[PDB]
């Protein structure tokens with residue numbers, strides 16, 4: 305029953321936001337329905353992985369610590385939709401990168417989605433003692449993601465930054481903080497059990513799980529065909545600082561690097577095929593198995609350190625880890 | 630001396646933001662200098678009208694109420710740059726509307742500028758009792774502006790919305806709240822004198838001053854030549870819901886409206902000239918003088934009601950009114 309409640313609080317959040325526009329913001333029904341359709345389009349359809357993690361962390365900490373239960377579980381669902389709305393905000397900003405009225409509405413949609421995370425928090429948490437701390441940690445993670453997108457975009461402008469340490473810097477800020485650390489931290493806040501956990505182990509686990517997720521995502525972007533991946537792999541044509549690129553450059557010959565540099569970042573189908581040819585011949589999908597196994601072991605062990613002082617919290621972090629593993 | 634301090638606090642704000650990226654966000658010098666140049670480009674060069682209003686309101690309320698003076702004046706300059714940074718955020722989002730790396734950096738610049746207003750507030754006001762209320766009123770105005778941009782963009786999609794009441798709705802949310810009400814409210818907060826003022830009269834004055842500013846801005850966009858306006862007038866080609874459009878439609882014949890509808894919203898130089906021809910023949914630059922005079926009188930009189938209970942606050946609102954008048 306965590307999903308059926310998550311979808312039920314969505315109707316409660318959407319009803320407040322649209323009524324507030326109708327009553328306080330002088331909005332007409334035509335635009336209200338236009339915003340209802342836009343909100344449903346961008347925020348619904350996904351797996352709600354980030355949003356459901358907030359609920360799982362919250363329900364684990366109240367059971368393993370009367371009216372306080374109903375409030376904490378409700379606050380968790382609101383935090384779950386804050387992240388999901390924030391994810392819809394990031395998705396809309398991606399479509400802009402790739403009198404034009406459809407581009408005006410797209411830019412405006414991204415602003416409203418971002419502001420809607422503030423409006424639902426300022427309303428449902430107005431009398432909560434954590435509203436200020438929630439907005440600060442939320443904005444800091446949002447700022448963190450924007451910095452990570454700067455690292456990722458300029459990863460080939462200023463192959464010097466094609467290193468494993470810089471790759472983990474990109475994964476840390478672009479993905480890890482808002483996908484893995486933010487849902488866990490929000491579950492701790494609404495459960496009022498933030499100081500009871502070791503934030504170092506928690507932060508370290510979030511970096512490893514985002515690292516495990518991004519490497520797996522990079523290999524799928526290259527080797528998985530389009531209809532099986534759900535999209536078209538574009539990392540090679542985009543010259544992205546992928547795990548395959550930084551691992552190839554470390555174990556390639558002097559010419560294989562030259563052939564890589566002469567083919568990486570091109571849109572030609574056969575240059576991209578030449579890059580996949582180089583990836584295949586270096587046995588990178590064998591190092592990928594070993595690299596992921598080492599990460600998964602660091603995850604299994606860092607979960608155990610956290611359960612010494614946070615027994616129930618580790619159960620939720622272990623549940624989230626299974627979704628990526 | 631309010632400007633020399635405003636530029637001095639800018640160096641204090643920029644130094645913290647860039648050092649925080651270098652120390653806490655693992656950023657390299659190349660990107661730090663790139664962000665310093667980007668911050669100076671987008672945030673400097675303007676008149677700082679919004680930012681300086683916060684200082685003028687703050688200095689008027691402490692003089693007309695020891696170490697508390699230095700702190701309030703410093704907090705005002707930080708709030709002044711929060712709005713100026715927010716204005717730079719809105720400007721960047723406008724250039725996007727009209728592997729593309731310069732569009733990626735442009736989108737990323739708008740996100741960093743918006744987040745930088747949160748970061749400087751979370752730092753300099755971390756121990757202030759108003760940090761939570763400042764962020765909430767700030768986000769609500771930011772949400773208000775995004776809603777106003779939705780009203781302005783879709784003002785010809787769903788000439789039904791070409792009315793004087795809807796025009797003032799656009800001006801209210803798109804411009805008035807963040808240009809006139811927000812700098813005044815921020816000056817009250819850092820002066821800790823927010824409850825001492827009538828927010829109704831203050832809100833009403835901000836709507837009138839933004840209304841006086843937008844009508845004057847619309848006429849300049851049409852009649853003022855490019856080299857004298859500072860830009861190229863584009864409202865007619867863009868089919869904007871301008872004061873000239875809504876006032877013409879009220880006093881035009883049945884055919885003059887038909888000739889207006891057949892020419893408004895076109896990029897042809899002579900159709901735009903036909904629209905200016907219609908504007909000239911309706912003596913709209915005579916009604917414009919009468920309409921602005923009535924607004925200016927409502928401003929002079931609403932300032933006097935506010936000075937009955939807020940004597941020094943009206944002096945700053947009267948100083949801001951002169952900048953638009």
Ligand SMILES: CN1CCN(C2N=C(Cl)Cc3ccccc32)CC1
Pocket residue numbers: 315344345348349
């Ligand atoms: C109150 N209702 C419930 C149904 N929806 C949904 N609307 C859309 Cl467009 C997509 C979608 C996808 C998954 C689950 C729900 C919905 C919102 C309005």
Ligand SMILES: CN1CCN(C2N=C(Cl)Cc3ccccc32)CC1
Pocket residue numbers: 640669670673674
């Ligand atoms: C410490 N310094 C002071 C000078 N500047 C400015 N830099 C630029 Cl690019 C434009 C500009 C415009 C007006 C005032 C100042 C500046 C920032 C760095």
